[PDB]
Amino acid sequence: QELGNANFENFIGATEGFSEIAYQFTSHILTLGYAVMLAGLLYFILTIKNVDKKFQMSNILSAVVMVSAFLLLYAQAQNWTSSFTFNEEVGRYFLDPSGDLFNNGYRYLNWLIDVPMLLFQILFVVSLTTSKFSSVRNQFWFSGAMMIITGYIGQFYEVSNLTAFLVWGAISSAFFFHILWVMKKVINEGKEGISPAGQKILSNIWILFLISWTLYPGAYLMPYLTGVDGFLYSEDGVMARQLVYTIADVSSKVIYGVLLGNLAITLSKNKEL
Amino acid sequence: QELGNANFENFIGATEGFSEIAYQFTSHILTLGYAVMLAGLLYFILTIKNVDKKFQMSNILSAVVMVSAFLLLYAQAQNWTSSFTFNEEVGRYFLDPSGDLFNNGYRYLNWLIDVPMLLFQILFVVSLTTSKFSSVRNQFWFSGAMMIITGYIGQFYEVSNLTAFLVWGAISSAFFFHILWVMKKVINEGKEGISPAGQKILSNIWILFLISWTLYPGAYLMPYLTGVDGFLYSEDGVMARQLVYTIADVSSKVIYGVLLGNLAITLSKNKEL
Amino acid sequence: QELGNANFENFIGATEGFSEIAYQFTSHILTLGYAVMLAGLLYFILTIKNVDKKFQMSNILSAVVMVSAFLLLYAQAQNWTSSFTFNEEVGRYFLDPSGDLFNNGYRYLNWLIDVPMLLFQILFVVSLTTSKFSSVRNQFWFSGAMMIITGYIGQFYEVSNLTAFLVWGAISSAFFFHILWVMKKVINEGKEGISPAGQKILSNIWILFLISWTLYPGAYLMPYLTGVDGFLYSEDGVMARQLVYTIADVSSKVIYGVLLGNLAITLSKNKEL
Amino acid sequence: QELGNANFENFIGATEGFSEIAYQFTSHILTLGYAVMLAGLLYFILTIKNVDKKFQMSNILSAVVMVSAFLLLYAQAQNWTSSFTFNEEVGRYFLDPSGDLFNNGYRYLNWLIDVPMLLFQILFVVSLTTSKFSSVRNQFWFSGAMMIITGYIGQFYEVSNLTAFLVWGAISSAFFFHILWVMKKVINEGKEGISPAGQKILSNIWILFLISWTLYPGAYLMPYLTGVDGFLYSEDGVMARQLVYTIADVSSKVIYGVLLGNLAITLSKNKEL
Amino acid sequence: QELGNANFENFIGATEGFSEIAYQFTSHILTLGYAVMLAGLLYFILTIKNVDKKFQMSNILSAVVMVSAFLLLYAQAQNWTSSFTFNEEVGRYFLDPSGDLFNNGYRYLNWLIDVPMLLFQILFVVSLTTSKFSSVRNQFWFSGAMMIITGYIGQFYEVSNLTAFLVWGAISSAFFFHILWVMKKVINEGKEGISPAGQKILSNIWILFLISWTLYPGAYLMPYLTGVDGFLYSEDGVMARQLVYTIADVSSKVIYGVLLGNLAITLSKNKEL
Numbered sequence A, B, C, D, E: 001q002e003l004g005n006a007n008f009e010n011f012i013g014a015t016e017g018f019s020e021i022a023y024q025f026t027s028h029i030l031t032l033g034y035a036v037m038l039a040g041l042l043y044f045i046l047t048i049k050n051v052d053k054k055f056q057m058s059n060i061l062s063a064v065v066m067v068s069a070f071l072l073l074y075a076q077a078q079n080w081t082s083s084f085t086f087n088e089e090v091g092r093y094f095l096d097p098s099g100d101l102f103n104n105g106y107r108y109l110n111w112l113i114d115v116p117m118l119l120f121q122i123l124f125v126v127s128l129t130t131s132k133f134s135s136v137r138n139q140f141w142f143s144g145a146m147m148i149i150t151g152y153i154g155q156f157y158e159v160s161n162l163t164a165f166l167v168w169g170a171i172s173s174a175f176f177f178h179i180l181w182v183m184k185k186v187i188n189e190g191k192e193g194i195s196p197a198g199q200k201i202l203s204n205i206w207i208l209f210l211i212s213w214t215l216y217p218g219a220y221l222m223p224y225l226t227g228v229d230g231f232l233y234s235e236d237g238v239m240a241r242q243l244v245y246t247i248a249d250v251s252s253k254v255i256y257g258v259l260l261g262n263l264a265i266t267l268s269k270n271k272e273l
């Protein structure tokens, strides 16, 4: 049938269908996703007063991000279950178009909150040295936006036009590297003039940041990481994508936020952990 | 097919249908919309105590507006997905009337909260000089209401009766200019007798106000901004409209609110920024 | 078609149908309704500490009322859209009985919260002189209940049995007048021994109370206020009814609550307006 | 139609159907139910600080109960409207089995929260004299559970097996009397050594407790209180049952909680009424 | 019918169907489940300040767990009612595949929150002696994850491949024993150097922990605990499973959390129990 500029899930769903395990796992992992986020929201609110006033914007922005991620991951969980329906005769879930086609683009546009705010929020915990606060912020936000928007365009074509897919993906990748560059700078300047404890945390944060954020382009490419007609262009690839998103999401948002909160505590004049 | 006094989305949806990208983007952008608003709600609540008591009503009214905008943008997101359904044979989303016709009027009536409160809330941060508080408030609220109501009538006719569309739109425009007039006055008087920092912010606020509020009549006209049978009388126009609303909404509500909060901090005896 | 003891909306919906504008407006105005209430809830909670402890129960009861009204107006918004479905052939929304018949009775029973609490809450702001607190409360609550219950019975018959409609309506009206009587007493005793500012507010409150509460029996009668086969026994009447309810609801609950809060501030030893 | 071990509502719904008034009222009264509970939740949270620390657990447990009752009464409201659908030809609502059969058992299992917590919470306000706190608590909780569970079994058979219905009901009744016994003791010991004001409240509480709790077995029996083929084995009985539950629910939970809160205030060293 | 790697509920549902009592009870018990959790959330938040600051993370993590469990138990309640639909002709609820197959796997992945956090949270109340905080945490979290993941795989095969079911189950059991081991250690070291009161509570906690956590593998095995074609491979088994989960859930999460909170109070320098 005619699907157009649609994500590859819909093509697997339309031709092969999804096994019980594939369908159910994808459902479960998204559910866990949004559950984590709402739990995180509660955590971050409830721990605001654990750090000095000046650090508390970090907690607030964590919370802001949790709201975004919850809403999206919740919405997307429902989108999954609507888009694919059990066929009794063969015993697999197939594309149910009355439910709309499944699209990962929901995530992308919601990153226009998540990404800016996640990058922003560190600047409230660490002190810069040679770099200017506003300058860093603006670079983060610009490159962030450009990264997302270009990627957002790309992913529409991941099946329909593999060239556009990769080119847009490439362009996106450029801006991603820019962000990585700037964040490294930030983390180094952050380490300057703070206890060894805080420096250890920032080291961890950087590793977390680097891995977790890298997963996202991983998910982008997921169906094609085993080349043409590969293992991953399958229900197995579908599962993998949503798993990776969920790991990325938990890492890049919740754990990131927790570490920052721990950093803020060390840097806090009253407070101890 | 008889549609009557219906928005142009329904006509595009009924004749041409929407591509994957068009349908999905519109869906995504509204989702982002309401996500932003609920995140904003949390922000504004959580930052109430960042400013002196006398300023805190600004935070509260921001919050009030966020609730309104969330509920509406959420409701409207659902309305979009209900009103247009995938047709397998051609691979486009077409008007599904069992879901009701799509209408932008939801926004308009909900502005009867948003507009009054947004205009009101500045009067709790800035001090007037030559203008009377009650006088400004009453002018805002009257012209606000008249603007919205006349526009609300107009938009029902954007397809069915182009004349009514434009005339009502014109009348609305009058009241809009009145508001612009009064807000300018407010901003100027606001700048009098406050730090240069606060004056810079109010300068920014005015630019934000002017652009963001102007987008709304832009969205009004969107289908016809490329004239008859133009580029924008199409799924491309539909997308554009909802994008512009979302940019307007985020600018005029969230960012506006944030700037005011920053102003309130500068004006605050305790606090610095 | 056999509808029985049903509200007149269902008869208009079943015979003539509703135009786009009629259906959409009714939908919009209810949406605005419940939006206002949830915004109000936030306001009243967030402003508790703006008045002296003894007054804060007024804020709490406002909040209680907002919860009720939100839930109801939300539920009723959904009931509207479920009860009437677009017919493609003629281009009007007709009764969809699979969605249940539309009934205004939802409002009425929910008044068993709203009315008692709204009458109650003033007694926490004003001081009585010659009247006993418990006595006033009991008169309010009794007459309130009797008003609502009798009206609730009436409205089931507004089409099926015009006599029952009017008789029950009459009986209700009696109890309504009793309430008006007692509230006037309260307002006068309230004015005794308080500043001219507070007296001005109570004057306004009384006018608000009188008009806003009177709208409700206005809505009761709405289909018949232009007599038989009148202008208002039509989709135009349907719109009018729900508009009037929404104006009444906002006036009698939110604005009422705001004014009381303003009164409480004047009467507050610390605080000024 | 084979219905089996189902509540009598489903039998009325399946044979006679429900009139507009019957269906709509049942819908309204459940809606009011859950509205009241959520309003109560807000109240009890918002008034925590109105009593001395030692009493505040009463407020918290009230709140706990409100959450339970809201969720259930909400869920049950939706169950009602799903289970019965308008038939156009005769103009009555009939059993719609695609919506599941209606069952009152939802209430019962949720009492496993409500009952224990309601009995518990008084023990935080009154001081016992003769009796041991833990001892009373354990008797309450055991007899509570046994009451509910036996009743829960009973009500499945209220149509299918009248004998089982009554026997289980009887057994339940035993445990109920035990609770009444213990609560009386508690209330008497509570009155010992406190002001006459507080003693008056506890007198009221006991009357409230006794009536409100007794309604519940009243609702159990409701269809059969006018014997076989009686007035109440009808849509009129259905209405009655849900009305009685709602009165019971509001009395036994909200009002009960309010009175306890008032008692706590009198007993409070700081505070006065 | 072809069901594949599906839970046994779906097989009972597809062949025998569920009686009124079976279907309704399963529905009720899940509803009670999620009700309990949301009530718990409120409790744990509202009692944060009953213990010394250092203990309050226990309250917060309890709360985190409640959010998770609520969302899941809620989602699963809805999944139950969607997956099984009344058949009029025979009067039983049968598998409705348009609702998706029922799967218990939702629980399992959500344990990836619950388990880590429940194990973690004790380490904020007790002081270790010979064991290292980080060491215990890491063992808990690793073995926890491995337990869940292996079990999660197992349960997909509980019908389709009894061998895989048991093997994976066995592997899981290994990791479970490891956790039991570590928790015992923790409890003993916890008891060292604290009051007799605190020691009593930890004794209770251990018993609670041991029983409640053991129920979960009980539920795993439930359909087969009466061997082949046993009593429990039936609607009776289905009921039993969900009952056991609910008991487990309330015990292992809510009561566990309460006891820890009580412990924290005894250990609290300010406060008394």
Ligand SMILES: CCCCCCCC/C=C\CCCCCCCC(=O)OC[C@H](O)CO
Pocket: C112, C116, C141, C145, D255, D258, D259, D262, D273
């Ligand atoms: C058919 C039944 C009709 C139902 C509608 C009837 C109205 C009842 C409304 C609220 C009751 C709330 C319970 C409050 C009871 C305690 C009131 C109280 O204690 O009085 C205030 C006190 O004097 C100040 O400190």
Ligand SMILES: *C/C=C(C)/C=C/C=C(C)/C=C/C1=C(C)CCCC1(C)C
Pocket: A111, A114, A115, A118, A147, A148, A150, A151, A152, A154, A169, A170, A172, A173, A176, A213, A214, A216, A217, A220, A249, A252, A253
């Ligand atoms: C909480 C969400 C986060 C941190 C999202 C991060 C997203 C990215 C780092 C996306 C990166 C991409 C590329 C660099 C290539 C493909 C397109 C993107 C946008 C997925």
Ligand SMILES: *C/C=C(C)/C=C/C=C(C)/C=C/C1=C(C)CCCC1(C)C
Pocket: B111, B114, B115, B118, B147, B148, B150, B151, B152, B154, B169, B170, B172, B173, B176, B213, B214, B216, B217, B220, B249, B252, B253
């Ligand atoms: C948060 C929502 C806001 C700030 C809405 C503002 C709306 C306007 C400024 C609307 C203006 C209009 C015109 C001036 C012409 C066309 C009709 C309107 C109402 C869209």
Ligand SMILES: *C/C=C(C)/C=C/C=C(C)/C=C/C1=C(C)CCCC1(C)C
Pocket: C111, C114, C115, C118, C147, C148, C150, C151, C152, C154, C169, C170, C172, C173, C176, C213, C214, C216, C217, C220, C249, C252, C253
């Ligand atoms: C917030 C809701 C309020 C204030 C509701 C007030 C309702 C009334 C004043 C109803 C009055 C009625 C009559 C006096 C005649 C017809 C029957 C009623 C109940 C609508």
Ligand SMILES: *C/C=C(C)/C=C/C=C(C)/C=C/C1=C(C)CCCC1(C)C
Pocket: D111, D114, D115, D118, D147, D148, D150, D151, D152, D154, D169, D170, D172, D173, D176, D213, D214, D216, D217, D220, D249, D252, D253
């Ligand atoms: C908030 C809910 C409450 C207070 C529920 C109370 C329930 C009862 C007192 C039930 C009593 C019953 C009998 C004594 C006989 C029939 C079976 C029961 C459980 C309905």
Ligand SMILES: *C/C=C(C)/C=C/C=C(C)/C=C/C1=C(C)CCCC1(C)C
Pocket: E111, E114, E115, E118, E147, E148, E150, E151, E152, E154, E169, E170, E172, E173, E176, E213, E214, E216, E217, E220, E249, E252, E253
């Ligand atoms: C709040 C949820 C909790 C405490 C869940 C605990 C889950 C377990 C202890 C699961 C144990 C299992 C086995 C040891 C064997 C079968 C597979 C599992 C995962 C059910």
Ligand SMILES: CCCCCCCCCCCCCCCCCCCC
Pocket: E138, E141, E142, E145, E146, E149
């Ligand atoms: C500072 C905190 C350090 C935490 C370390 C704890 C690590 C626990 C993470 C568990 C990851 C388990 C990976 C399982 C691999 C999948 C194998 C499944 C068998 C088929």
Ligand SMILES: CCCCCCCCO[C@@H]1O[C@H](CO)[C@@H](O)[C@H](O)[C@H]1O
Pocket: A162, A221, A224, A225, A227, A228, A229, A230, A233
């Ligand atoms: C850097 C990673 C990008 C690798 C691109 C792999 C190219 C895959 O190629 C595509 O594989 C699909 C899956 O079977 C086929 O259906 C398509 O016809 C084919 O174009």
Ligand SMILES: CCCCCCCCO[C@@H]1O[C@H](CO)[C@@H](O)[C@H](O)[C@H]1O
Pocket: B162, B221, B224, B225, B227, B228, B229, B230, B233
């Ligand atoms: C200020 C901007 C208003 C300009 C009005 C443009 C006139 C549009 O003209 C309209 O275009 C529609 C779509 O192309 C056609 O379907 C209509 O028949 C036509 O009247």
Ligand SMILES: CCCCCCCCO[C@@H]1O[C@H](CO)[C@@H](O)[C@H](O)[C@H]1O
Pocket: C162, C221, C224, C225, C227, C228, C229, C230, C233
């Ligand atoms: C206080 C105002 C009450 C006025 C009562 C007027 C009764 C109107 O009369 C009614 O009008 C309906 C609508 O046209 C008709 O359908 C009814 O058959 C007719 O009885």
Ligand SMILES: CCCCCCCCO[C@@H]1O[C@H](CO)[C@@H](O)[C@H](O)[C@H]1O
Pocket: D162, D221, D224, D225, D227, D228, D229, D230, D233
């Ligand atoms: C304590 C009060 C218990 C009285 C129970 C006796 C009434 C049982 O009467 C029942 O009435 C039903 C409908 O009316 C009939 O369908 C049953 O056949 C009949 O047993």
Ligand SMILES: CCCCCCCCO[C@@H]1O[C@H](CO)[C@@H](O)[C@H](O)[C@H]1O
Pocket: E162, E221, E224, E225, E227, E228, E229, E230, E233
């Ligand atoms: C306690 C853990 C081991 C239990 C293994 C019991 C073996 C169950 O055996 C299974 O029972 C099903 C239900 O009757 C049958 O339908 C299957 O054919 C059979 O494989």
Ligand code: NA
Pocket: A080, A081, A082, A083, A084, A085, A086, E098, E099, E100
């Ligand atoms: Na599905």
Ligand code: NA
Pocket: A098, A099, A100, B080, B081, B082, B083, B084, B085, B086
């Ligand atoms: Na759709």
Ligand code: NA
Pocket: B098, B099, B100, C080, C081, C082, C083, C084, C085, C086
């Ligand atoms: Na509709």
Ligand code: NA
Pocket: C098, C099, C100, D080, D081, D082, D083, D084, D085, D086
């Ligand atoms: Na129905």
